[PDB]
C-alpha cells in the first residue's frame, strides 16, 4: 500500500516507522510505496529549518487511503485521507509510473517494527489521541497528558489520554494496606489496572509500546513518563501473570536496541532503570534487557576516576553495645 | 646458586619457618592480605558475578579468621595442584587461591624484612617513594669523597641497564633449591608448584614450565630474591659486604663504615630498581686506561667508530649531553663489557642496546642517568664553565652547594601521557562531558603530582599539555554543536562541579574575557548591575595547576626539618616521663614524607606489619585490569602528598565568583534567590548527564556571540535558537509544553486587570478594558498591540516616558483620556538580558511603529525575562500609577501561578525557620528512636542485636507539647518497618484532632519518612509533609531521664504526653524557647555526662514532678545557657582543631574556612559526677587477641563490673582482687568468682594497694583460687604502665607471681578493658622500683606484659567481700592507712568512693 505526498515544499527529514531519510527543497519526492499492510505505522517530520518540533501521524493503511500535503498557512506537513478511491487510486501511477516515489524496505532479520508495535492498536491509539473526525493520529513534542492537565479550552486532541498511573494515590493504595500496597504494587497492577482498565495484558503492553515510540520519535515528556511508569509498575509487583513476565524482557530489549544514542539521556530515567534492573521484584526476569542496557548505557547504571580533592536511616539506632577488638 | 649460600652464611641468615599454629601476628597478616584483595572493589558500585563471587569469598575468610588460617596452612602444607590462570599482560587467579597467595605474600615480606634478607641497595623499597629515591641517589653520588675532582685525570662512570628477561627465564628446580635456603620447604614447594600451572590465553591453554607468573601475589618476593642472586654476581661477595655493612650492624642505603672502604673499590655505588641496575664507578687514570686496554684487546677499534651506536641522552642540549671523546667512549664500553661478562645468559640477558653509560671526566663535565621516569643531569659547581627543575646538591661536610641536578621528564613518559590523553578522546562513546573532563583531570594530576618541577623544564611536555587541553575542550564543543563556536566562555569548562561546571583543571594560558564578568540582581527597589573594570593580566587568567603543587625539593627539605623536630620532641617527652602529644606536633601535621600525621592514625599499629607494600602496589599492574595512577604512593603509609582544594577556590574567584558564574546559567530561572548547593558505597562519584549540563549552561552557550548564522525562533515560544545544539531544543520544548508561553502572558494580563479593577475610584479610572488579542501575539517578537486599554473619569496628566523605578518623572507636559498596557515576554541569554534596556527600546520602536496599532500615544510596556526571572517597565505615568505597578509587579512575579509552573518545569529539567513560629499549627516528627538496639560484636562478627523500647517524638514547636508514643518491643526487614509504623501512628494522631487543631504542616527530621507519611496522609491533602536541612537533636530526647524511664519501663503501647517547654512561654516567646531547647538537647547529644552535671549540680534548685528540667531562675538560665553555648563549639574546636573565629552560627553548617588564628568547699561536686558513671557502661570495649586452648581466657560477670564502676571515681584510680576457681571439666577455663575490695590509696597516675587479703576467717571462703586484681584508669594504653608494674611485683613476685592485671579505662560514655600477663623481667624491675606515680619511668619497657584471654558474662553473678570495717578508700585518710596492715573481712555490699564517711 502507498502514501502519496502532493509535494515537498521545504527541506525536511522524514521518518517512516524505524526508517528515516532527508528531502531537499523542492526535490521531486511524491511519497512512499510498498508499505507492508499489516501494521500501525507512523510517519514523522523534523524540518531541517530547526524552527519546528518533531511531529508525526499514526495511521492504519487498512482504515483508509492516506496522503501527505504541506500546509503553508500552518507551516507543516499534514496527513489527509482521500475519500474517493478512484481519484486516489489515480495519483499513483503518475508518481509510481514516473517513479518519484520511494519503496519501504523489505524486512531485516530481526523483524524489528513488529517487535516494537506487536501489541499497539490503532483503535487504542485513537482513544488516547482524540480527534474523532480523522482516521489517523497526530502527535508532537509539546503535547501534555490528561494526567498532567488534570493535576494542574486547549484542544482536547492536543492532550494524550494515557491511562493515569499514580503510585501514591487512593487508586493505588487500599486503605488499611498502606505499607503492603506501596511496597508491593501487585494489587494496583492486577486488580485495578489489568483486570479493571486494560482488560488484557496485550492492551497494557500496547500502551507501553505506544508511549515509548512517542517518547523516542517526538521526545514527548509525558510519553516517557508513562512508558517508565508502566515498566515500573510491573517490576515493582511481586505477583505478575507469568505470560507477561516472559514477554516483558523481549519488549524492553527491542525498545532499548532500537533507541538511537542521541535520544538516550533525554528518554531514560536513571532511578527507574536502576531499580527495575537491580533491586525490583522482577529484576531477574529482565536478563536480556539488563545486558543490553549495561552495554549501551553503562554510565547510567554505574559502570567503571580518582578523588582530585584530597545516613544511617536504613540502620537501627544503637543505644549501646558490647564490642571485642584490638584497641 | 652458591653465591647465595656464601652470602646467606656470611649474613648468618635465619630461614623463615612455616607459620606456627600460634603465630603471634597471624590475624594481622591475614587481614592485610584480605584488605589488599577487597580494595579492588572499594570504588565500584555494581559488581558483576565473578566480582560479586570473589567478594563473597573474601568475606567468608574474614568472617572466620581462625578457620581460614587452618584452611590456608593446610594448602601450603599439602596443596600442590592448582587451577588454570587466565591472562589478557594481566593474570586472573582463582579467588580461593589468591587468599592463600596473598597471605603467603604478606607473611614472607614481613618475615624477610625482620630478618634483613634484602640488602639496602634493593629497590623499590618501603623507605621511599620513587621521586625521593631519585633525590637520595643523586645526593649520595654528590657526597662520594673526591668524586668530582678530575685533577689527576680521574673518571666517574654511571652504568644504567636492564636485566633482560629476568622473570621470563626462571628455572623451577633452581628456584626451589634457592627458596629452600630462606624459607620453610613446604612453602618453597607451594610457590614453585604454584607457578607450574596452565595458562589460558582465551583459546590456547598452555602449561607454564618455566618463567615467573608476575600476577601471583608473592611474585614480587621471588623477583627481588632472584634479583639478589644477580646483584651478587655483579658485585662479588666482598664489595656486596662492604655496601651492605655487617649483619649485626648494617649499612643504610649508600652509606659506608669508613671513607677507606668507600674508596677501596672502583664500584662506589649500586642500586637496583627492580629490573634496572645502576652502578657508579670511580677510576684513577691508569685504573681506567688499564681497563680500557684489556677491553680494546678483545674488541679493538681500528678505525675509531666506537662512537657510532653509543647510546646518548638526546633530551639534553648537545652541549649538556655526554661528549663523545674517544677515550671516554672506550672507557664506557669497557665498563659495560666487564659488567656484562659477570652474569650468565641463563639468569638474564644484558645487552648494549638497552644500556646507557655516562662518563664524567676532565672532558665531560656532566654526569647523566635516567631513573623512575626522570632524566637527570649532574653538573658539579667547579665545572660550570637552565634555571628549571633544579635540585641544589649540598655537600654534607661543607654544608655548601657543590653541584646542581637538572631534571626533565623522560621521552618515554611524555609519550605515555600523550597516549592517555589521545585515549580519552579515543574511547568509545557517547561519553558524557563530565566524564571526559574527569579523565583529563586524573591524567593531569597523576602527571603533576609525580613529576612536579621536572615538567616545567620539559618543553615538549608543556606543549603536549596545551594541545591536550584544547583537544578536550574541542570534543566538548563538538558534542554541543556540529559547528565550532566563534567564542566560548571558559566558565563552562573551569567552573567546579559543585556549581555545574566540568571542573577542568588548567595547564594553559586561558584568558577570561571581560564581557563574561558581568552580572545583575533584581531587588525590590530595582535592578542593579556589575560590569568589570581594569585588571592586570593574571587577574584575567584561569588559574593553572603548576603553582598548586609543592616541588619535590621543598617537600624533601621541609621533611628533613620536621622529622628532625619530631625526634627532638620525642627526646624531651621521654626525658620528662611523658608520652608525646599530638597537639605538640600540630602544625607539622601536613608536612614531611611520610607525613607527620601518619604517626597518629588509628591503623598505625597494624600497618607496622605491612611490608613489601611499595613493590606490592607496583605489581598490581600484573594482577589487576584497571589500576590507580597513584601506584607510587600509599596514603596509609605516606599520608596525603598534595592538596588542590585551593585551586577550586581560586578558579571561582578568577571567574568572578559565584554571582558571575551563575549568571551564565539558568539558575535565576529556577526562581531561587540564594545559592545553597543541592543538585541531588557511601560516596558520590556522580556525573552530570549532558542533557542537564547543556540546559544549565544554555544561556551562555545558546547565544549569538558563541554561534552565528543560524538563528531561528522556536514554535509556540519567543525562544531563539542559535544553533543545532543537541538536547537543548527538546529540553525547552518540554519546559514550555502545553503552550506555556501563551498562558503565562494571558495569566499575567489577567492579574493586572484584576488589580486595576480594585483601584478605579482611587486612580480616577472610568473603565479597564481587556483587549482580546491574536493567539500568537505573545510571541510576535517584531510587533505588538495593547493588552489592556484603560479609561478616564475625566483626564490624566502624564509624564514623558520613564522606567518603572525612575523616581522623579514630572507630570506636566501632557494630557490624555486613554492609557494602555502591553505585556511583553522574552527569553534572554547571557549576551542580552537587560530587561530595562529591552523594554525601553521596544516601547520606543513599537510606538513609532506604523504596524503596531495602539489606541493612544500614552502607554506603559511591561517586560518579563522568563529565563532570568527579571522584570521592568517603561512608559508614560500619571500620579499614583507607578507605585501601584511596582507593588503589583512585585507580587505577580512571586505568586503568579503560570510562572510558578515555569519555574517548576525548569527545576525538573535541571534535576533540582522564622516561619516555624507562625500561626500555622505545625509538628515535628522524629523517628530516630523508634526502633533502637544494643550490640554484641563478637571478636568473630555475626553481630547480634536486641531490641528495646523506642518512641515517636512528635512536637509542636510553637507551643511545646509532646506526644510521645512508646513503641513497645512486642511490635517487632525491620528498620524499614519502623518508618511505616511511625507514619501510621502520626496519621492516627492527626485523625483524632478535629480540623481546627490539625497541623498545616508536619516536618520530618529524616528524609526516609517522607514517602511512608505521604502515603498514610493521602486522606489529608491540605497537610504538607516537609523535610529538613537542619540537623535536629530530638534524637537526644532519650538522655532525659524522665522520658527514658517511661519508655524503658513501659510494658505496652501507650501515648504519654508532656510539655518539653515547661512553662517558659510564661515569660518567654516560643522562638526563644526552642533555642534553649535546642541548646539543652544538642549538649546532651555531645556529652550525656557533661550535660547532666550542669543540671544535678545544684540540688537545691530542683525539678517538680511536672517537668523534665530543673525549675531554674531566668539569669542562671541565661548562665546555664551560656556554658553550653561554647561547648557545642568546643566539640567543634577539639574535633576540628579550630580555636576561635568569625561569629557565624552552627545549627546547619559543619565547617568553613579559617585559618588565620586571628586575632592575636563542698565538692563533693563529685559524688554527683560519680552518680553518672553507669552511663559509661552503655558501651563496653573488651580488648581481644586470638584464642588458644593452651593460653587461657578469664571470664568476668556483669554485676561485679556494674557496681565496680558504680563505686569507682572519675579522676582517681580504684582497685581490687579477683578470686577464680576453674569450672569442672574446664581446666583451661577460669571464672572470676569473687572480687575483694581492699584498703587502698589511689592516684590519677597511680595507687597504693593493700596486701594479699587473708580470706581465711570469712565464711565459705573455700575451694577458691585467687587469679588477680582489676583496676580502673583514665589513660588508655596498650600496656601496663610503670605504676601498674610496680604494683604487680609488689604483690605477686612471691609467692604466686602469676596473677593478672585487669585495667579499665573510663572515658565518658565508654569503658575499655584490657588484661596483661606480667613478665619476670617486669617482675624484677618494679621490685627495683617503688612509689611510682608515672606511666613512663626510666628503664620502663612495655614488652613485659602479655595478653591473657578475657571474656565477660550475663551468665553468672559473683560475690563481693568488703573490709569488715566497711572502709576501702583512704585517699582522704592517708595517715590512717597502713599498706602492711593485717585486715579482716565479711560478705557485704560495697560503698561508693564518696560514701559520706571516706
DSSP for A105-174, written as a single string: P---TT-HHHHHHTT--HHHHHHHB--TT-SSEEEETT-EEHHHHHH----GGGEE-PPP--SSSTTTS-
Q: Does residue B691 sit at the A interface (CB-CB below 8 Å)?
A: yes
Question: Within its chain, how far is the Cα of B137 from the centroid?
Answer: 33
Contact B328, B359 (CB under 8 A): yes
The DSSP bridge partners found for residue B1201 are: none
Question: Which residue, among A71, A142, A170, A312, would best test binding to B if mutated, counting the most B CBs under 10 Å from its CB?
Answer: A142
| Domain span including residue A111 | 1-142
Distance, in Å, from the CA atom of A228 to the CA atom of A223, rounded to the nearest integer, reads 9
Calculate the alpha carbon distances from B642 to B287, B449, B450, B544, B613 in Å.
Answer: 48, 7, 10, 15, 20
- Under DSSP, is residue A313 helix (H, G, I), strand (E, B) or coil? coil
On whether both A35 and A136 belong to a single domain, the answer is yes
On whether both A241 and A170 belong to a single domain, the answer is yes
On whether both A138 and A192 belong to a single domain, the answer is no
Are A221 and B939 inside 8 Å of each other by CB? no
Distance, in Å, from the CA atom of B1089 to the CA atom of B1091, rounded to the nearest integer, reads 5
In DSSP notation, B283-345 reads E-HHHHHHHHHHHHHHS--TTS-TTTT----TTS-TTTSPP--HHHHHHHHHHHHHHHHTS-T
Are A308 and B441 inside 8 Å of each other by CB? yes
Are A310 and B1014 inside 8 Å of each other by CB? no
Breaks (C-N over 2.5 A) in chain B follow: 88, 385, 680, 912, 972, 1160
Distance, in Å, from the CA atom of B72 to the CA atom of B34, rounded to the nearest integer, reads 12
Phi, then psi, of B453 in degrees rounded to 5: -65, -15
Distance, in Å, from the CA atom of B320 to the CA atom of B323, rounded to the nearest integer, reads 8
- Min Cα–Cα distance to chain B from A209, Å: 21
Angle between helices B1070-1086 and B1114-1136 (to 10 degrees): 50
CA angle centred on B923, ends B919 and B928, rounded to 5°: 155
- Min Cα–Cα distance to chain B from A5, Å: 24
- Residue B817: CB partners within 8 Å, gap ≥ 6? B791, B792, B794, B795, B796, B856
Contact B398, B430 (CB under 8 A): no
On whether both A57 and A111 belong to a single domain, the answer is yes
On whether both A203 and A252 belong to a single domain, the answer is yes
Contact B803, B836 (CB under 8 A): yes
Helix (H) or strand (E) segment spanning residue B790: strand B788-798
Distance, in Å, from the CA atom of B590 to the CA atom of B191, rounded to the nearest integer, reads 41
Are B932 and A144 inside 8 Å of each other by CB? no
- Closest to B1178 (Cβ–Cβ): which among A221, A300, A320? A320
Report the chain B residue with the minimal C-alpha distance to residue A301.
B46
Report the chain B residue with the minimal C-alpha distance to residue A222.
B734
Sign of CA dihedral B1200, B1202, B1207, B1212: positive
- Closest to A316 (Cβ–Cβ): which among B439, B503, B975? B975
DSSP-derived secondary structure letter, B799:
P
On whether both A148 and A133 belong to a single domain, the answer is no
Distance, in Å, from the CA atom of B1227 to the CA atom of B324, rounded to the nearest integer, reads 83
- Min Cα–Cα distance to chain A from B378, Å: 34
- Min Cα–Cα distance to chain A from B522, Å: 29
On whether both A223 and A312 belong to a single domain, the answer is yes
Calculate the alpha carbon distances from B74 to A239, B26, B468 in Å.
Answer: 48, 15, 54
Burial of B1102 (0-12, 13-18, 19+ CB in 10 A): exposed
Distance, in Å, from the CA atom of A305 to the CA atom of B43, rounded to the nearest integer, reads 9
CA angle centred on B39, ends B38 and B45, rounded to 5°: 90
Question: Within its chain, how far is the Cα of B1235 from the centroid?
Answer: 46
Are A306 and B628 inside 8 Å of each other by CB? yes
| Residue at a domain's end among A92, A108, A142 | A142
The answer for B 573-612 residues in CB contact with A (under 8 A) is 602, 605-606
Task: Read off the C-alpha cell for B1222.
Answer: 576453674
Task: Read off the C-alpha cell for B110.
Answer: 614481613
Report the chain A residue with the minimal C-alpha distance to residue B48.
A303
| Residue at a domain's end among A142, A163, A179 | A142
- Closest to A314 (Cβ–Cβ): which among B689, B975, B1181? B975
Contact B874, B527 (CB under 8 A): no
On whether both A49 and A150 belong to a single domain, the answer is no
Find where cell 482516521 sits. A135
Question: Which residue, among B712, B734, B908, B1089, would best test binding to A if mutated, counting the most A CBs under 10 Å from its CB?
Answer: B734
Are A179 and B629 inside 8 Å of each other by CB? no
Sign of CA dihedral B315, B321, B327, B332: negative
Question: Which residue, among A157, A313, A325, would best test binding to B if mutated, counting the most B CBs under 10 Å from its CB?
Answer: A313
Query: Cβ contacts (< 8 Å) between A182 and chain B: which residues?
Result: 1011-1012, 1015
Query: Cβ contacts (< 8 Å) between A324 and chain B: which residues?
Result: 937-939, 1181-1184
End-to-end Cα spacing for chain A: 82
Q: H-type helices in B506-551, by residue range? A: none
Breaks (C-N over 2.5 A) in chain A follow: 152, 304, 310
Name the nearest CA neighbour of B160 among B3, B359, B296: B359
Query: Domains, chain B, ranges and CATH?
Result: 1-360 (no CATH), 366-480 (3.30.43.40), 481-736 (no CATH), 740-911 (3.90.1570.40), 913-1147 (no CATH), 1148-1398 (3.40.140.10)
- Closest to A178 (Cβ–Cβ): which among B503, B733, B1015? B1015
Q: Domain count of chain A?
A: 2
Helix (H) or strand (E) segment spanning residue B984: helix B974-992
Distance, in Å, from the CA atom of B36 to the CA atom of B24, rounded to the nearest integer, reads 21
On whether both A137 and A152 belong to a single domain, the answer is no
- Min Cα–Cα distance to chain A from B370, Å: 28
Distance, in Å, from the CA atom of B450 to the CA atom of A59, rounded to the nearest integer, reads 65
| Residue at a domain's end among A142, A163, A183 | A142
- Min Cα–Cα distance to chain B from A311, Å: 9
CA atoms within 13 A on the CB side of A303: 14
Question: Which residue, among B738, B742, B926, B1351, would best test binding to A if mutated, counting the most A CBs under 10 Å from its CB?
Answer: B738
The answer for B 506-545 residues in CB contact with A (under 8 A) is none
Resolution (A): 3.1
Q: H-type helices in A134-281, by residue range? A: 146-151, 178-183, 186-187, 201-218, 221-235, 242-258, 264-267, 270-278
Distance, in Å, from the CA atom of B259 to the CA atom of B282, rounded to the nearest integer, reads 14
Q: Does residue B445 sit at the A interface (CB-CB below 8 Å)?
A: yes
Amino acid at each position: 500500500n502507498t502514501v502519496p505526498f502532493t509535494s515537498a515544499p521545504i527541506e525536511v527529514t522524514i521518518g517512516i516507522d524505524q526508517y528515516s531519510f532527508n528531502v531537499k527543497e523542492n526535490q521531486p519526492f511524491h511519497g512512499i510505496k510498498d508499505i507492508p499492510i499489516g501494521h500501525v505505522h507512523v510517519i514523522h517530520f523534523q524540518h531541517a529549518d530547526n524552527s519546528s518540533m518533531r511531529y508525526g501521524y499514526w495511521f492504519d493503511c487498512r482504515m483508509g487511503n492516506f496522503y501527505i500535503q504541506y500546509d503553508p498557512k500552518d507551516g507543516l506537513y499534514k496527513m489527509m485521507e482521500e475519500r474517493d478511491g478512484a481519484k486516489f487510486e489515480n495519483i499513483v501511477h503518475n508518481f509510481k509510473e514516473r517513479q518519484m516515489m520511494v519503496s519501504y524496505p523489505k524486512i531485516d532479520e530481526d523483524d524489528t517494527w513488529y517487535n516494537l508495535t506487536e501489541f499497539v492498536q490503532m483503535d487504542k491509539i485513537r482513544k488516547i489521541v482524540r480527534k474523532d473526525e480523522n482516521q489517523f493520529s497526530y502527535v508532537d513534542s509539546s503535547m501534555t497528558t490528561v494526567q498532567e492537565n488534570e493535576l494542574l479550552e486547549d484542544d482536547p486532541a492536543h492532550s494524550l489520554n494515557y491511562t493515569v498511573i499514580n503510585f501514591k494515590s487512593r487508586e493505588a493504595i487500599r486503605p488499611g494496606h498502606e505499607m503492603e500496597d506501596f511496597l508491593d504494587k501487585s494489587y494496583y497492577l492486577n486488580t485495578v489496572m489489568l483486570q479493571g482498565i486494560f482488560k488484557n495484558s496485550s492492551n497494557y503492553f500496547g500502551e507501553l509500546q505506544f508511549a515509548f515510540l512517542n517518547a523516542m520519535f517526538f521526545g514527548n515528556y509525558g510519553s516517557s513518563l508513562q512508558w517508565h511508569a508502566m515498566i515500573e509498575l510491573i517490576c515493582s509487583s511481586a505477583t505478575v501473570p507469568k505470560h507477561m513476565l516472559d514477554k516483558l524482557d523481549e519488549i524492553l530489549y527491542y525498545q532499548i536496541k532500537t533507541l538511537p544514542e542521541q535520544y538516550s539521556d533525554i528518554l531514560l530515567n536513571e532511578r527507574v532503570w536502576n531499580i527495575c534492573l537491580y533491586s525490583s521484584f522482577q529484576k531477574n526476569s529482565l536478563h536480556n534487557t539488563e545486558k543490553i542496557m549495561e552495554n549501551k548505557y553503562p554510565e547510567l547504571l554505574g559502570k567503571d576516576d580518582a578523588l582530585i580533592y584530597g545516613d544511617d536511616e536504613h540502620n537501627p539506632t544503637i543505644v549501646g553495645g558490647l564490642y571485642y577488638q584490638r584497641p | 646458586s652458591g653465591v647465595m649460600v656464601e652470602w646467606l652464611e656470611s649474613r648468618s641468615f635465619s630461614p623463615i619457618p612455616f607459620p606456627p599454629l600460634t603465630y603471634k601476628n597471624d590475624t594481622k597478616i591475614l587481614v592485610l592480605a584480605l584488605e589488599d584483595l577487597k580494595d579492588v572493589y572499594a570504588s565500584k558500585v555494581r559488581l558483576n558475578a565473578s566480582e560479586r563471587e570473589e567478594l563473597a569469598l573474601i568475606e567468608e575468610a574474614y568472617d572466620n579468621p581462625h578457620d581460614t588460617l587452618n584452611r590456608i596452612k593446610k594448602y601450603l602444607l599439602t596443596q600442590r595442584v592448582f587451577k588454570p590462570v587466565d591472562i589478557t599482560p594481566v593474570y586472573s587467579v582463582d579467588p580461593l587461591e589468591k587468599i592463600t597467595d596473598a597471605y603467603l605474600d604478606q607473611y614472607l615480606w614481613y618475615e624477610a624484612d625482620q630478618r634483613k634478607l634484602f640488602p639496602n641497595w634493593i629497590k623499590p623499597s618501603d623507605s621511599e617513594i620513587p621521586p625521593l629515591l631519585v633525590y637520595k641517589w643523586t645526593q649520595g653520588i654528590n657526597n662520594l669523597s673526591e668524586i668530582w675532582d678530575v685533577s689527576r685525570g680521574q673518571s666517574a662512570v654511571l652504568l644504567e641497564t636492564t636485566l633482560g628477561e629476568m622473570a621470563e627465564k626462571i628455572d623451577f628446580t633452581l628456584l626451589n633449591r634457592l627458596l629452600r635456603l630462606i624459607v620453610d620447604p613446604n612453602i618453597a614447594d607451594y610457590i614453585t608448584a604454584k607457578n607450574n600451572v596452565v595458562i589460558n590465553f582465551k583459546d590456547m591453554s598452555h602449561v607454564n614450565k618455566y618463567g615467573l607468573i608476575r600476577g601471583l601475589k608473592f611474585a614480587s618476593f621471588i623477583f627481588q630474591y632472584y634479583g639478589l642472586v644477580i646483584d651478587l654476581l655483579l658485585l662479588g661477595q666482598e664489595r656486596a659486604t662492604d655496601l651492605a655493612g655487617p649483619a649485626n650492624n648494617p649499612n643504610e642505603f649508600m652509606q659506608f663504615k669508613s671513607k677507606e672502604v668507600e674508596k677501596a673499590h672502583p664500584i662506589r655505588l649500586y642500586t637496583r630498581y627492580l629490573d634496572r641496575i645502576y652502578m657508579l664507578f670511580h677510576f684513577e687514570e691508569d685504573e681506567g686506561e688499564e681497563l680500557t686496554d684489556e677491553y680494546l684487546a678483545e674488541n679493538p677499534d681500528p678505525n675509531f667508530e666506537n662512537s657510532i651506536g653509543y647510546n646518548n641522552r638526546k633530551c639534553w642540549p648537545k652541549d649538556s649531553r655526554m661528549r663523545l671523546i674517544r677515550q671516554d667512549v672506550n672507557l664506557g664500553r669497557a665498563v659495560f663489557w666487564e659488567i656484562q661478562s659477570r652474569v650468565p645468559t641463563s639468569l638474564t640477558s644484558i645487552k648494549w642496546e638497552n644500556a646507557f653509560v655516562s662518563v664524567y671526566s676532565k672532558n665531560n663535565p656532566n654526569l647523566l642517568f635516567s631513573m623512575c621516569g626522570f632524566e637527570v643531569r649532574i653538573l658539579p659547581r667547579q665545572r660550570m664553565e637552565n634555571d628549571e627543575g633544579v635540585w641544589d646538591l649540598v655537600d654534607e661536610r661543607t654544608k655548601q652547594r657543590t653541584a646542581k641536578a637538572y631534571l626533565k621528564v623522560s621521552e618515554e613518559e611524555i609519550k605515555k601521557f600523550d597516549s592517555r590523553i589521545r585515549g580519552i578522546l579515543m574511547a568509545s562513546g557517547s561519553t558524557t562531558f563530565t566524564k571526559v573532563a574527569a579523565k583529563w583531570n586524573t591524567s593531569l594530576i597523576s602527571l603533576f603530582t609525580y613529576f612536579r618541577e621536572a615538567i616545567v623544564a620539559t618543553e615538549p611536555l608543556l606543549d603536549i599539555l596545551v594541545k591536550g587541553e584544547t583537544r578536550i575542550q574541542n570534543r566538548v564543543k563538538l558534542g554541543l554543536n556540529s559547528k565550532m563556536p566563534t567564542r566560548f566562555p571558559p566558565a563552562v569548562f573551569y567552573t567546579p562541579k559543585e556549581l555545574g561546571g566540568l571542573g577542568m583543571i588548567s595547564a594553559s594560558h586561558i584568558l577570561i574575557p571581560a564581557s563574561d564578568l558581568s552580572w545583575s540582581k533584581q531587588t525590590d527597589t530595582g535592578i542593579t548591575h556589575f560590569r568589570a573594570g581594569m585588571t592586570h593580566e593574571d587577574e584575567k587568567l584561569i588559574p593553572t595547576i603548576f603553582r598548586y603543587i609543592t616541588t619535590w625539593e621543598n617537600e624533601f627539605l621541609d621533611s628533613q626539618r620536621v622529622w628532625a623536630e619530631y625526634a627532638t620532641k620525642r627526646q624531651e617527652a621521654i626525658q620528662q616521663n611523658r608520652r608525646l602529644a599530638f597537639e605538640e606536633l600540630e602544625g607539622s601535621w601536613d608536612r614531611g614524607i611520610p607525613r607527620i600525621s601518619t604517626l597518629f592514625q588509628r591503623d598505625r599499629h597494624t600497618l607496622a606489619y605491612d611490608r613489601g607494600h611499595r613493590i606490592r602496589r607496583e605489581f598490581k599492574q600484573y594482577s589487576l585490569e584497571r589500576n590507580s595512577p597513584f601506584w607510587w604512593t600509599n596514603s596509609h603509609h605516606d599520608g596525603k602528598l598534595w592538596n588542590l582544594n585551593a585551586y577550586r577556590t581560586d578558579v571561582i574567584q578568577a571567574l568572578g565568583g559565584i554571582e558571575t558564574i551563575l549568571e551564565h546559567t539558568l539558575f535565576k530561572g529556577t526562581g531561587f534567590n540564594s545559592w545553597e548547593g543541592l543538585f541531588w558505597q557511601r560516596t558520590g562519584l556522580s556525573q552530570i548527564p549532558n542533557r542537564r549540563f547543556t540546559l544549565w549552561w544554555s544561556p551562555t552557550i545558546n547565544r549569538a556571540n558563541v554561534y552565528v548564522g543560524f538563528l531561528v525562533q522556536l514554535d509556540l515560544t519567543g525562544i531563539f535558537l542559535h544553533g543545532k545544539i543537541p538536547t537543548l531544543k527538546i529540553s525547552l520544548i518540554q519546559i514550555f509544553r502545553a503552550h506555556l508561553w501563551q498562558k503565562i502572558h494571558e495569566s499575567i494580563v489577567f492579574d493586572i486587570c484584576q488589580i486595576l479593577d480594585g483601584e478605579l475610584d482611587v486612580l480616577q479610572i472610568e473603565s479597564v478594558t481587556k483587549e482580546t488579542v491574536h493567539p500568537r501575539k505573545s510571541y510576535k517578537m517584531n510587533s505588538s498591540a495593547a493588552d489592556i486599554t484603560m479609561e478616564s473619569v475625566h483626564e490624566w496628566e502624564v509624564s514623558k516616558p520613564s522606567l518603572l523605578h525612575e523616581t522623579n518623572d514630572s507630570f506636566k507636559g501632557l494630557i490624555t483620556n486613554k492609557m494602555w498596557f502591553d505585556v511583553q515576554l522574552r527569553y534572554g541569554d547571557y549576551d542580552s538580558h537587560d530587561i530595562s534596556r529591552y523594554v525601553r527600546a521596544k516601547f520606543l520602536d513599537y510606538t513609532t511603529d506604523n504596524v503596531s496599532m495602539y489606541p493612544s500615544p500614552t502607554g506603559v510596556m511591561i517586560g518579563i525575562d522568563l529565563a532570568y526571572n527579571m522584570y521592568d517597565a517603561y512608559g508614560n505615568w500619571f500620579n499614583g500609577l507607578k507605585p501601584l505597578i511596582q507593588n503589583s509587579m512585585r507580587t505577580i512575579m512571586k505568586a503568579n501561578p503560570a510562572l510558578y509552573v515555569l519555574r517548576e518545569r525548569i527545576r525538573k529539567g535541571l534535576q533540582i525557620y522564622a516561619e516555624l513560629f507562625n500561626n500555622d499549627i505545625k509538628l515535628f516528627v522524629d523517628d530516630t528512636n523508634v526502633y533502637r538496639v544494643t550490640v554484641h560484636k563478637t571478636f568473630e562478627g555475626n553481630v547480634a542485636t536486641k531490641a528495646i523500647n523506642g518512641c515517636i517524638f512528635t512536637l509542636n514547636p510553637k507551643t511545646g507539647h509532646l506526644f510521645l508514643k512508646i513503641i513497645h518491643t512486642s511490635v517487632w526487614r525491620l528498620s524499614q518497618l519502623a518508618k511505616w509504623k511511625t507514619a501510621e501512628e502520626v496519621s492516627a494522631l492527626v485523625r483524632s484532632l478535629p480540623k481546627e487543631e490539625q497541623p498545616k504542616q508536619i516536618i520530618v527530621t529524616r528524609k526516609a519518612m517522607l514517602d511512608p507519611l505521604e502515603v498514610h496522609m493521602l486522606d489529608f491533602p491540605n497537610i504538607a509533609i516537609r523535610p529538613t536541612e537542619n540537623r535536629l537533636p530530638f534524637s537526644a530526647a532519650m538522655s532525659i531521664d524522665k522520658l527514658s524511664d517511661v519508655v524503658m519501663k513501659a510494658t505496652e503501647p501507650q501515648m504519654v504526653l508532656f510539655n518539653i517547654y515547661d512553662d517558659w512561654l510564661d515569660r518567654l516567646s516560643s522562638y526563644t524557647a526552642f533555642s534553649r531547647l535546642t541548646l539543652l538537647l544538642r549538649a546532651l547529644k555531645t556529652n550525656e555526662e557533661s550535660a547532666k552535671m550542669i543540671l544535678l549540680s545544684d540540688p537545691t534548685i530542683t525539678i517538680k514532678s511536672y517537668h523534665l528540667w530543673p525549675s531554674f531562675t531566668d539569669e542562671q538560665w541565661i548562665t546555664i545557657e551560656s556554658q553550653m553555648r561554647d561547648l557545642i563549639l568546643t566539640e567543634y574546636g577539639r574535633k576540628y582543631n579550630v580555636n576561635i573565629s568569625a561569629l557565624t552560627q552552627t545549627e546547619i553548617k559543619d565547617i568553613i574556612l579559617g585559618q588565620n588564628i586571628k586575632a592575636p568547699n563542698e565538692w563533693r561536686k563529685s559524688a554527683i559526677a560519680n552518680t553518672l558513671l553507669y552511663l559509661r557502661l552503655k558501651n563496653i570495649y573488651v580488648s581481644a587477641d586470638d584464642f588458644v586452648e593452651e593460653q587461657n581466657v578469664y571470664v568476668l560477670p556483669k554485676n561485679l563490673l556494674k557496681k565496680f564502676i558504680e563505686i569507682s571515681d572519675v579522676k582517681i584510680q580504684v582497685a581490687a582482687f579477683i578470686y577464680g576457681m576453674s569450672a569442672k571439666d574446664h581446666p583451661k577455663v577460669k571464672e572470676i568468682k569473687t572480687v575483694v575490695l581492699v584498703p587502698q590509696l589511689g592516684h590519677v597516675g597511680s595507687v597504693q594497694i593493700s596486701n594479699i587479703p587473708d580470706i581465711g576467717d570469712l565464711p565459705d571462703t573455700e575451694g577458691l583460687e585467687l587469679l588477680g586484681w582489676i583496676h580502673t584508669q583514665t589513660e588508655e594504653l596498650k600496656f601496663m604502665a610503670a605504676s601498674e608494674v610496680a604494683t604487680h611485683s609488689k604483690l605477686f613476685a612471691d609467692k604466686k607471681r602469676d596473677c593478672i592485671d585487669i585495667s579499665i579505662f573510663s572515658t565518658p560514655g565508654s569503658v575499655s578493658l584490657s588484661a596483661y600477663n606480667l613478665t619476670d623481667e617486669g617482675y624484677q624491675w618494679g621490685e627495683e622500683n617503688k612509689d611510682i606515680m608515672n606511666v613512663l619511668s626510666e628503664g620502663f619497657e612495655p614488652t613485659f606484659s602479655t595478653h591473657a584471654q578475657l571474656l565477660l558474662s550475663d551468665r553468672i553473678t559473683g560475690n563481693f567481700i568488703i573490709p569488715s570495717g566497711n572502709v576501702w578508700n583512704y585517699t582522704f585518710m592517708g595517715t590512717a592507712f597502713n599498706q602492711e596492715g593485717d585486715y579482716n573481712f565479711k560478705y557485704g555490699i560495697p560503698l561508693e568512693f564518696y560514701n559520706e564517711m571516706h
